[PDB]
Amino acid sequence: TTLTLSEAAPLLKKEFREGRLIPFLGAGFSKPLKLPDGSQLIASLAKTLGFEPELFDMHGRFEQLAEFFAISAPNRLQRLVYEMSLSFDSAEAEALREKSPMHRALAALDWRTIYTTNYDKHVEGALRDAGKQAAVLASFADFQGPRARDVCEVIKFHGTLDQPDTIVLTESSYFQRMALDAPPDQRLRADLLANSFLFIGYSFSDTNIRYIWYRMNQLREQSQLGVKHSQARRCFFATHGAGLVQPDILQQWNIDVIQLDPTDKSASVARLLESIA
């Protein structure tokens, strides 16, 4: 009911040599850089507001606690972006990034499009470390700006720290992305029409990501394809610790789960990215 690493490796080679495999990188991909995930941010927002971090967690979800933070005082969200810039893109996080085996194995492949939902320059920065060049696309001005001819386009799906208007963190910013009208939303839905995705270090907790894969099946089911042909183009979900409910929800959306070895999280991902080559 779940692919292993050796089973999923010839399936990922076929989609990569055809140029139809696109990585989707989450907050767990920057975990070996000693960065906060979605839980250590809330522990830092609770310290500023005067909450204990265990009491602040039980008043709402991740989107709702950041919405409460941003309206506590004026200019409270601007300060957070400044603080995150200092801690996510610091020089000691740069130094952990050249010697990271996941970021080396990611940049060794010749991708054309990479999607990320984290606010750090460590995915395009991994491509600059390997001598390659990348193109960060986050806002409308980036898509219409000049690029080079054949350069890997890194789509910052949730925003970048050097453009603080593009960061979606609060609940009102997730509701603004439910219209699927932002330039990262329109680019994602067109790439999903034709490409397989590889989710690495990401857990489907964002209700706007799950809503995009929902509405691709409304195109898939209305097109009245067979049992054989509607199940042909799959997406892949590499996860150490998926539960018992979530892999069966995603089978509806043509998403297969690749079970990685949970003893060493960083080496299991790196062996997956080296098996694509």
Partner 1 sequence: APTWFYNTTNSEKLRELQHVLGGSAKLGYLTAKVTEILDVDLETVIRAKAIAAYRAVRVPVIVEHGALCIDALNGLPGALVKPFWESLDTRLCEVIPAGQRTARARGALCYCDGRERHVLIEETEGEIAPSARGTGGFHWDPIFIPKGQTRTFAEMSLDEKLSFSPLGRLHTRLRTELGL
Encoded one letter per residue, x for contact with its own copies by CB under 8 A and - for no contact, window 218-257 reads: -------------------------xxxx-xx--x-----
Nearer to ligand NCA, 2 or 82 (CB): 82
Q: Any idea what DSSP says for residue 160?
A: B
Residue (of 119, 115, 122, 215) closest to 168 by Cα position: 119
Taking CB under 8 A as the rule, does residue 74 contact its own copies?
A: yes
Buried b (16+ CB within 10 A) or exposed e, 197-217: bbbbbbbbebebbeebbeebe
Candidate ranges 24-32, 33-41, 160-168, 195-203; the one touching its own copies (CB under 8 A): 160-168
User: Which residue from 2, 4, 64, 133 is in contact with its own copies, where contact means CB under 8 A?
Assistant: 64
Taking CB under 8 A as the rule, does residue 50 contact its own copies?
A: no
Distance of CA 121 to the CA centre of its chain: 13
In the complex, the smallest distance separating the C-beta of residue 206 from its own copies, rounded to whole angstroms, is 12
In the complex, the smallest distance separating the C-beta of residue 30 from ligand NCA, rounded to whole angstroms, is 4
- For residue 251, CA distances in Å to 8, 82, 154, 201 come to 16, 40, 27, 19
Phi/psi of residue 106, each to 5°?
-70, -45
User: Which residue from 31, 51, 60, 274 is in contact with partner 1, where contact means CB under 8 A?
Assistant: 51
Nearer to its own copies, 257 or 269 (CB): 257
Q: How many Cβ atoms from other residues are within 10 Å of residue 23's Cβ?
A: 24
Distance of CA 139 to the CA centre of its chain: 17
Q: Which does 214 bind (CB under 5 to 8 A by kind): ligand NCA, partner 1, its own copies, none?
A: its own copies
Q: Name residues contacting ligand NCA, limited to 118-177 (CB under 6 A).
A: 118-120
What is the C-alpha to C-alpha distance for residues 23 and 197, in angstroms, rounded to an integer?
6
In the complex, the smallest distance separating the C-beta of residue 243 from partner 1, rounded to whole angstroms, is 6
Phi/psi of residue 256, each to 5°?
-95, 145
Taking CB under 8 A as the rule, does residue 196 contact partner 1?
A: no
User: Which residue from 16, 24, 29, 56 is in contact with partner 1, where contact means CB under 8 A?
Assistant: 56
User: Which residue from 3, 12, 35, 70 is in contact with ligand NCA, where contact means CB under 6 A?
Assistant: 35
In the complex, the smallest distance separating the C-beta of residue 154 from partner 1, rounded to whole angstroms, is 29
Q: Which does 263 bind (CB under 5 to 8 A by kind): ligand NCA, its own copies, partner 1, none?
A: partner 1
Residue (of 230, 139, 221) closest to 187 by Cα position: 139
Are 124 and 154 in contact by the 8 Å Cβ rule? The answer is yes
- β-bridge partners, 237: 199, 257
User: Which residue from 18, 47, 219, 241 is in contact with partner 1, where contact means CB under 8 A?
Assistant: 241
Alpha carbons within 13 angstroms on the beta-carbon side of residue 44 total: 13
Instruction: Provide the binding-site residues for partner 1, judged by CB under 8 A.
Output: 4-5, 49-52, 54-56, 58-59, 240-244, 259, 261-263
Instruction: Provide the binding-site residues for ligand NCA, judged by CB under 6 A.
Output: 27, 30, 35-38, 41, 88, 118-120
